[PDB]
Amino acid sequence: RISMINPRVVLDENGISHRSRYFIMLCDNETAIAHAKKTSIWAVKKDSSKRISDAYKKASVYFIFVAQQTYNALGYAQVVSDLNSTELPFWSDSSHAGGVRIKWIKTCNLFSAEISEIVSHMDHGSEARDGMEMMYDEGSRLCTLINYAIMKRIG
């Protein structure tokens, strides 16, 4: 099983790479995304914490940040620490299991129709669920689209 966009990337049964794994973060709080972009911390939901923590121990993990109401691209970051119940950001609530440190790769606030299309179909054809893992080809495409949109915006 080989990635459709990268012949050198082997995929598991789910279409997920063994080495690079991608999760979507759907944010509806300007204060939370602004805080995360300044302090490089994110809060992980209890519902997706086990799969995200297991991925952190096995591979490189990236969060792709998308606005809930618009699907605006907000950036993407590598997760660089495991879940910690004592380092939760101030905006977290009872639905969060713990915080993770992140390392921002790109940060923006823009719209891409191509990005919105991918997020709109990420749940096997339906709208993405917050915290879900995506396929390798979706994460690779989204990161490239963010890089390309940032690139074109500076011009």
Author numbering: 331 to 485
Show me the paper's own sentences about this structure.
A C-terminal YTH RNA-binding domain in Mmi1 recognizes UNAAAC motifs (where N is any ribonucleotide) that are present in multiple copies within DSRs. Surprisingly, Mmi1 binds DSR RNA using a divergent mechanism on a surface that is distinct from the m6A-binding pocket, including extended protein sequences located upstream and downstream of the YTH domain. We propose that the low-complexity region influences RNA binding indirectly by reducing dynamic motions of the RNA-binding groove and stabilizing a conformation of the YTH domain that binds to RNA with high affinity.
We also determined a structure of apo-Mmi1 residues 327–488. The core YTH domain of our structure of Mmi1-RNA is similar to apo-Mmi1 and to previously reported structures with a central five-stranded β-sheet surrounded by four α-helices. Interestingly, the low-complexity N-clamp region adopted a similar conformation in two structures of Mmi1 determined in the absence of RNA (this work and Ref. 21). Both apo- and RNA-bound structures have crystal-packing contacts in their N-terminal regions. Furthermore, structural alignments of all known Mmi1 YTH domain structures show that the core fold is highly similar (r.m.s.d. <0.5 Å), but the N- and C-clamps are more divergent. This observation is also consistent with higher relative B-factors in these regions.
